[PDB]
């Protein structure tokens, strides 16, 4: 079953969380998908001190927990610092490690000590073959006998890799589709269709179709019921309708192979 | 006065710190230099779990304090977590923000709330003009009235930028010398000669000569008595004699302009 992770960039309020969770219900009920609801409790590196951060760890987890209970959703959130992982894992089913923190030992180990699936985002500065090292830190934390990171062992141990593109000069990200294949030797691979498009959004669907054809284990895409009124990533988020179309296309492509 | 920050990549032992400090003694007394001794208390991004980490914050700071006392040296060290800033500033005269963490708001704010100079390293994924936002978070923490970051104000309030190169494909960093000029409109600029060389330390001297000709406020270079027996970054460190040639050439070039 292919994975879909979807939800808003940041936790905005419980009411907005409920609205988007409600519009995701058809997709959450799709028998061909293993569905996870995403929302960030903290935006840690916004442009300005004044930019919206979200509710922070304790209140954010509370809100995600309410969504888990109200909708029966599995939950993904990202962590940023040590000492968040064990607390966040009581609520989140997947704990995502941000792209810039993908080589951070202590964080990888701490998240991997929890019961959560670990989703490690590949830094835009990384050679995909070098992601084997962060997979291995996570694997060794879970089974100390493991010497080499393979897809089968990583799947067994809930350790995933996530493609979000690579730095292509200044203010541009390029998705090297070769990386989807390279990384999948080491771990299941999720393609992030939201944060991989930077051109110095309309491309999210076509990149996701390409990724589905190459071969991936799932899709990450941020979604919001009224993106123009979003507090974070508003310009890059899909309408639930648009997300549905993209998933339909993914599933048709995957049904060929 | 031009800044020189020099020292080992990681604190290996007090014996090693004392050995490298002794060799740097002629440079530390150079009246044309404003000298800081550098050593990291923790290596956070190593290849494997078994990789040497360093003594850690508590013992690391104690060791850095011993060098400050014995050699009369001002101290630089890098910090990785918000919670480390307060205590590290009791020993460290400069607190450096690692390149991958150059957008992290809380770390920037916490370090800026100390009395330390803040050296903000430009991540390899960053457009150099974008570094203004990081300088501005730090400046606003120190002086709430400031609206846009400038060299003059950053100099006054102890907030610097550090060039360490940009991602150029996979496994490669290029130094765009245009960046030294671009960033210097926002803040004094330090050039990191040892972590800017990656090619898929021989190039350290030539890039530092280039940087000096362009216009920099200082140089950062890791140096070790016996790089071959180093516990970290041994491939890229300079011998103290190599560093001295590098500094001599930089000062000659700067004398010209």
From Swiss-Prot, chains A, B:
Gene Ontology terms, MF aspect: 3-deoxy-8-phosphooctulonate synthase activity
Keywords: Cytoplasm, Lipopolysaccharide biosynthesis, Transferase
Top-level taxon of origin: Bacteria
Localization, UniProt: Cytoplasm
Chief location category: cytoplasm
Pathway: Carbohydrate biosynthesis; 3-deoxy-D-manno-octulosonate biosynthesis; 3-deoxy-D-manno-octulosonate from D-ribulose 5-phosphate: step 2/3; Bacterial outer membrane biogenesis; lipopolysaccharide biosynthesis
One Gene Ontology term, aspect cellular component: cytosol
Catalytic activity: D-arabinose 5-phosphate + phosphoenolpyruvate + H2O = 3-deoxy-alpha-D-manno-2-octulosonate-8-phosphate + phosphate
Enzyme Commission code: 2.5.1.55
Entry-linked InterPro entries: Aldolase_TIM, DAHP1/KDSA, KDO8P_synthase
Keyword Transmembrane helix set for record: no
GO annotation (BP), single: keto-3-deoxy-D-manno-octulosonic acid biosynthetic process
Pfam families from the UniProt entry: DAHP_synth_1
HAMAP family in UniProt: KDO8P_synth
Protein family per UniProt: Belongs to the KdsA family.
Protein name per UniProt: 2-dehydro-3-deoxyphosphooctonate aldolase
Organism whose genome encodes this protein: Helicobacter pylori (strain ATCC 700392 / 26695)
Classification of source organism: Bacteria, Pseudomonadati, Campylobacterota, Epsilonproteobacteria, Campylobacterales
Gene that this polypeptide is encoded by: kdsA
């Amino acid at each position: 079953k292919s994975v879909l992770i979807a939800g808003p960039c940041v936790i905005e309020s419980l009411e907005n969380l409920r609205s988007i969770a409600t519009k995701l219900q058809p997709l959450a009920n799709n028998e061909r998908l293993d569905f996870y609801f995403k929302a960030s409790f903290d935006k840690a590196n916004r442009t300005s001190l004044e930019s919206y951060r979200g509710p922070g760890l304790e209140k954010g987890l509370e809100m995600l927990q309410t969504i888990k209970e109200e909708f029966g959703y599995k939950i993904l959130t990202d962590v940023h610092e040590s000492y968040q992982a064990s607390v966040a894992a009581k609520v989140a089913d997947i704990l995502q490690i941000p792209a810039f923190l993908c080589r951070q030992t202590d964080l990888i180990v701490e998240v991997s000590q929890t019961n959560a699936i670990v989703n490690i985002k590949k830094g835009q500065f990384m050679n995909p073959k070098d992601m084997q090292y962060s997979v291995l830190k996570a694997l060794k934390t879970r089974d100390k006998s493991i010497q080499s990171p393979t897809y089968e062992t990583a799947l067994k141990n809930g350790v995933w890799l996530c493609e979000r593109g690579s730095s292509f000069g200044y203010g541009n990200l390029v998705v090297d589709m070769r990386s989807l294949k390279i990384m999948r030797e080491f771990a299941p691979v999720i393609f992030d269709a939201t944060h991989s498009v930077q051109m110095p959004s309309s491309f999210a669907p076509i990149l996701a179709r390409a990724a589905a054809a190459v071969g991936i284990d799932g899709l990450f895409a941020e979604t919001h019921v009224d993106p123009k009124n979003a507090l974070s990533d508003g310009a890059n988020m899909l309408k639930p309708d648009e997300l549905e179309q993209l998933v339909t296309d993914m599933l048709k492509i995957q049904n060929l192979f």
